[PDB]
């Protein structure tokens, strides 16, 4: 590897970086180094070139592509190294940036006018309840609305009038309404409980007129008259001139505001709100010290009076203005040019040369990567990102362990921690034992990286470790919940960090089908927000349903419409890149996405069907599923075994179902040597982690290394009874599976856990589908709702899987890829597709995906909750002693193959099952006994 490093630096920051860059490369003179070094040498040079201080101006070239660029060095757009560098370049009708500047400046000088009431003064001094009857943002909104109703609010002297209690402060003037919504929602968004309003309201002001004081601001309301008697000590020199210059800025630019569309207004006001909380939290974090008394805004850690309200308003204004400037004029730090990506894929990765069919100069890109598992999907996503140049992306993945797997792939192929940042925000205690030096695994949290210039506008220089890893990451391999808060939050400033993260970075969401329906709705909201700033969305899901692919394209198309009309460019359409392991297709799609997507789906189906059938599923006829499991285990051991040894996966639905199947199979008298494992999610930290590592090392069938992790000498049935934790994110390879039916994507995923690593075709049948789910004996009205898309609004007419599924069927992604809306009441696949198009629709609703008008409100974050689960309290095992109503028990010790013990950790119990003892056990975790 031959690199060349050039320095642009002034100071002796052309000198103390010269020591480190002259420790690793030869000096060719004139502050230019050039030579041969290894990739780990590149990583060491990066780590000790960035850590040496601020102001390092370093460009590295590997062959002729830029390896890395330290700082905001413009370096190369076409040629490299400019010369007569300057300021003043373009100076356009920027319009919408002047609009955002005027809105943020006018609102930020009015965002805390409502702290001047006597209640907030005695709240800061501390002789009343610290919770206000009406929040000060609403009081400042009442001030601004009363001033606007009285005088002309855009060109007049200010003077705060006598204000009363107003239920609504939103009128008709679109720009005033924007300023009012920025003022009122500078801490939290208003929440609308009204069902008719949630049913009908769509527009900007027409929804904003329904935002009343009862949506969170009106806490208790007994001291309203003191909350609206206000002093007017803000009339000073610099506050009045700042208010005048920003109001006239808005006055001069609001003529382009009425030429915007609804989508524009929503996205622009979201940006304005994010910059306003950025400036407000930035000025509230630091201590300024000086004060002019008689009025105060915030308190220090000692509770003393600080940050008087005139200079508080001025500081929040300038900090929000500077926030806006750096978030709207940033050339963000991108990743290194990974040299182990750009070469050809060989063999089964040979489809990854589809990036040589995509244009490298497209400003936008919507990848739908429909490639099957085991083909290197995430490596292909990184290849697609690097085809357009240097990489800046957020790999948002479900589960901690899947982020760990993608991080380990990124580490061992070409990516160091100067470009990658693995973020899992829980600090799990799963450590690697055996040998620390001989590990060559366990990707960790260090991020030598490079701190971006956006950290100076965040509160108190961003944060410590976690938010520095969030914001400053070129490549952010993260759990997805660090990105879905970009679309907005209920309370606080947790929106700004993923918002500013997704503003300048691409978004790569892998296996989006494993998320929930509301989770997929907020993920497509994130896709729309990412496309709002021209970034590229890579979706990587093999079993995509047309509905999902369509609504994600429509979210990207609305976002790219926002980005196109935001830079005053005519919208040519979205560069959609359909991708699988058999080919690629790049089309400029502005309309008719459905026929092209279904034609690519049909081409992928015909490229999947002439291949040999790997998963032949038979739906059993035996009604009782206990003895159906027994007979199917006996049949698939007598048919599918490797010299007497067979691996079976009993995929069931819930935990007590799993322990019921386990306790039946343990007490089942047979000549077969059944060896039973329980693989559900309710387990203690230690025990769970141990199951994972063992299962990953015994079900690895790409080699014969497993022969030494199990007793393959004696003919044995190694059976793993598992819940849907096996069908998501597990690289497992079973000889056969017996599936309790809950949804068709569960069938396809548990087919993907059988012969995942081998290529031998089954002869007779490798999957035995149960006749009924076990909830049929508990609830015959609805049985597929647990881990399925059946529900109270979408009920199957019959629950028989002979009626709702094929008796003999080759299970692949084809049934999920096709998409059928008719006959959803008597087939599982059409039931699935129905729900997917009836929840992820092209409407705005309130919990929908095109959400417009409601982004202003708190409604999409309350009624569409990301990871909406049950109450979930956590019973914690502390050194062998349980906390709550747990009561350790003893398992049946009949056929347990492996049982790992646990002493620490915690189990997640729903509040429903907290009533009784969860009865934790070493073999199977939680049950009802």
């Amino acid at each position: 590897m031959f690199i060349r490093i050039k320095c642009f630096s002034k100071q002796p920051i052309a000198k103390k970086v010269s020591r480190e860059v002259s420790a690793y490369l030869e000096y060719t003179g004139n502050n230019t180094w050039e030579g041969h070094i290894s990739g780990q040498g590149v990583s060491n040079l990066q780590t000790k070139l960035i850590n040496v201080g601020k102001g390092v101006k370093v460009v590295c070239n590997y062959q002729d592509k830029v390896l890395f660029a330290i700082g905001n060095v413009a370096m190369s757009d076409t040629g490299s190294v400019p010369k007569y560098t300057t300021k003043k370049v373009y100076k356009p009708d920027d319009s919408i940036f002047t609009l955002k500047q005027g809105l943020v400046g006018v609102a930020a000088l009015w965002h805390d006018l409502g702290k001047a009431n006597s209640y907030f003064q005695r709240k800061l001094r501390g002789e009343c309840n610290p919770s206000d009857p009406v929040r000060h943002e609403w009081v400042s909104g009442v001030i601004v609305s009363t001033f606007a109703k009285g005088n002309d609010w855009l060109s007049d002297d200010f003077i705060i009038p006598e204000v009363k209690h107003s239920d609504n402060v939103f009128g008709d003037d679109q720009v005033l309404n924007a300023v009012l919504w920025l003022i009122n929602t500078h801490h939290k968004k208003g929440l609308v409980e009204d069902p008719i309003y949630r049913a009908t309201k769509t527009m900007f002001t027409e929804t904003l007129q329904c935002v009343n004081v009862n949506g969170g601001w009106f806490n208790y309301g007994d001291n309203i008259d003191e909350c609206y008697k206000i002093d007017t000590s803000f009339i000073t020199d610099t506050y009045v001139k700042q208010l005048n210059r920003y109001r006239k800025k808005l006055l001069a630019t609001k003529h382009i505001w009425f030429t915007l569309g609804e989508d524009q207004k929503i996205a622009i006001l979201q940006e304005c709100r994010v910059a306003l909380m950025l400036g407000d939290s930035n000025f509230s974090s630091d201590l300024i010290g000086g004060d002019g008394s008689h009025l105060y805004a915030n308190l220090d850690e000692c509770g003393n009076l600080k940050q008087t309200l005139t200079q508080h308003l001025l500081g929040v204004t300038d900090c929000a203005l500077k926030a806006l400037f750096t978030i709207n004029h940033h050339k963000p730090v991108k990743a290194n040019f990974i040299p182990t990506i750009a070469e050809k894929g060989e063999g089964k990765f040979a489809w990854q040369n589809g990036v040589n069919m995509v244009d490298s100069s497209i400003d936008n890109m919507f990848c739908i990567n429909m490639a099957s598992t085991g083909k290197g999907k995430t490596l292909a996503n990184l290849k697609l990102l690097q085809h357009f140049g240097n990489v800046r992306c957020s790999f948002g993945l479900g589960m901690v362990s899947l982020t760990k797997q993608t991080a380990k792939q990124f580490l061992d192929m070409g990516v160091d921690y100067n470009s990658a940042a693995m973020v899992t925000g829980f600090s799990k205690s799963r450590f690697n034992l055996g040998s620390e030096s001989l590990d060559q695994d366990e990707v960790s949290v260090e991020y030598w990286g490079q701190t971006s210039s956006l950290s100076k506008v965040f509160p108190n220089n961003n944060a410590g470790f976690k938010n520095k890893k969030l914001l400053s990451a070129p490549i952010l391999v993260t759990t997805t919940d660090h990105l879905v808060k970009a679309s907005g939050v209920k309370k606080g400033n947790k929106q700004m960090l993923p918002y500013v993260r997704c503003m300048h970075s691409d978004l790569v969401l892998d296996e989006i089908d494993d998320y929930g329906i509301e989770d997929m709705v907020v993920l497509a909201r994130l896709v729309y927000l990412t496309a709002c700033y021209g970034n590229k969305v890579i979706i990587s899901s093999a079993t995509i349903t047309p509905a999902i692919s369509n609504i994600f394209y429509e979210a990207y198309s609305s976002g790219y419409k926002v980005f196109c009309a935001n830079k005053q460019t005519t919208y040519k359409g979205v560069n959609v890149v359909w991708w699988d392991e058999f080919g690629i297709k790049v089309e400029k799609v502005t309309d008719q996405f459905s026929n092209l997507n279904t034609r690519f789906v049909n081409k992928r189906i015909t490229n999947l069907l002439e291949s040999t059938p790997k998963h032949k599923a038979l739906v059993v006829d035996q009604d009782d599923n206990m003895e159906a499991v027994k007979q199917s285990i006996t049949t698939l051991h007598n048919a599918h075994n490797s010299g007497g040894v067979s691996f079976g996966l009993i995929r069931t639905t819930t935990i007590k179902d799993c322990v019921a199947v386990t306790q039946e199979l343990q007490n089942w008298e047979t000549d077969l040597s059944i060896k039973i494992l329980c693989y559900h999610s309710r387990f203690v930290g230690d025990t769970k982690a141990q199951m994972e590592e063992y299962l990953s090392k015994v079900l690895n069938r790409k080699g014969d290394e497993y022969k030494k992790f199990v007793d393959t000498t004696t003919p044995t049935a190694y059976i793993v009874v598992a819940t849907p934790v096996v069908e998501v994110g597990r690289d497992f390879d079973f000889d056969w599976a017996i599936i309790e039916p809950s949804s068709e994507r569960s069938i396809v995923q548990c087919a993907g856990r059988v012969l995942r690593h081998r290529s031998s075709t089954p002869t007779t049948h490798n999957i035995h589908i149960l006749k009924y789910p076990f909830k049929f004996y508990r609830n015959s009205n609805i049985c597929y709702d647990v881990a399925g898309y059946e529900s109270k609004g979408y009920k199957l007419k019959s629950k028989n899987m002979l009626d709702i599924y094929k008796k003999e069927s080759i299970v692949n992604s084809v049934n999920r890829l096709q998409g059928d809306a008719a006959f959803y009441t008597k087939s599982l696949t059409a039931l699935e597709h129905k729900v997917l198009l009836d929840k992820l629709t092209t409407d705005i609703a309130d919990t929908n995906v095109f959400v417009g008008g409601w982004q202003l409100t708190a409604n999409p974050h309350e009624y569409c909750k990301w990871r909406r689960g049950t109450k979930n309290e956590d019973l914690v095992l502390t050194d062998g002693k349980w906390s709550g109503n747990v009561t350790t028990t003893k398992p049946i010790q009949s056929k347990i193959w492996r049982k790992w013990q646990g002493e620490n950790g915690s189990i997640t119990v729903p509040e429903y099952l907290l009533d009784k003892t969860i009865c934790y056990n070493d073999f199977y975790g939680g049950y009802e006994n």
């Binding site: 413009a74 010369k83 790049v586």
Partner: protein, 295 residues
């Protein structure tokens, strides 16, 4: 400027994109909106194409034309399907040598001499193929390329008109497009409006060979209004007649390799400078067009 590098001996070529070209301190330099001013070696530049979002002052054209740099623009009729008017300013302030115009027009007016000259320039396609070989693509000596070159020569030998010629072009180019595509394992349809790299790199190389061909023409004084190939789809003049000598030998292998080996636009552009100066293609075309006019 002393003697001034012979225009066959100029090695730098550029197609600038999204910049303001101006003169600073007597420097031909393009400035981007990020504040970066990159200079251009104007006394060594063959051509400067200007892509979308580009702009150039008067003085930059004044000291590019005094140094013999041809400046064209990639829009207007630059959609490359009609190929009608790629807006291409030449330096005619320098009074060019005349004799290549004289021998060129003596053969132009005479239609039989024009037909024979067209056949020589059609044979220059296969001459280019043999002279400029590539070690990362199609071998010229394999059975398919040798068969199609033999078919092309035996068809252009017995050719009678320019309509018969237009057809032989269809065959050579389209089937060489295809033969590469099947060896590069890609279903490929030539489309100037297509987004795949196999077409955007091909259009970039089309502009590069346009610049090389137009610089070779202007060098000798030859214009563009005297083409040898007349047809319905051959609008564009003599610059495309000179340029399609080196599509399938140079521009097409470099574009196909670039797309297959995932090069970026910048490195394909550079691979084009490396092939155009390592084998000295400008002097090749200039000397070969001297062979074409001659008497």
């Amino acid at each position: 400027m002393q003697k001034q590098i012979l225009t066959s001996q100029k090695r730098n070529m550029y197609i600038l994109s999204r910049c303001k070209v101006l003169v600073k301190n007597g420097q031909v330099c393009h400035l981007h909106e990020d504040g970066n001013v990159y200079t251009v070696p104007y006394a060594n530049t063959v051509f400067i194409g200007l892509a979308e979002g580009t702009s150039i002052t008067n003085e930059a054209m004044s000291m590019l034309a005094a140094n013999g740099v041809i400046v064209f623009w990639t829009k207007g009729g630059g959609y490359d399907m009609f190929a009608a008017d790629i807006i291409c300013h030449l330096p005619q302030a320098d009074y060019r040598p005349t004799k290549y115009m004289q021998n060129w027009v003596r053969l132009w007016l005479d239609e039989e001499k024009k037909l024979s000259a067209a056949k020589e320039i059609l044979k220059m396609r296969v001459d280019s193929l043999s002279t400029h070989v590539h070690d990362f693509g199609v071998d010229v000596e394999n059975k398919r390329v040798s068969s199609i070159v033999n078919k092309f020569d035996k068809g252009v030998t017995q050719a009678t008109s320019f309509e018969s010629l237009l057809g032989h072009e269809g065959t050579f180019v389209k089937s060489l497009y295809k033969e590469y595509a099947l060896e590069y394992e890609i279903e490929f349809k030539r489309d100037h409006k297509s987004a795949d790299n196999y077409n955007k790199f091909l259009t970039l190389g089309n502009y590069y060979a346009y610049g090389i061909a137009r610089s070779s023409l202007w060098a000798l004084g030859i214009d563009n209004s005297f083409p040898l190939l007349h047809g319905s789809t051959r609008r564009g003049g003599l610059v495309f007649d000179v340029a399609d000598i080196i599509k399938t030998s140079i521009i097409l292998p470099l574009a196909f390799h670039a797309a297959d080996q995932g090069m970026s636009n910048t490195e394909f552009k550079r691979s084009c400078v490396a092939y155009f100066d390592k084998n000295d293609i400008l002097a090749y075309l200039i000397n070969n067009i001297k062979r074409l006019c001659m008497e």
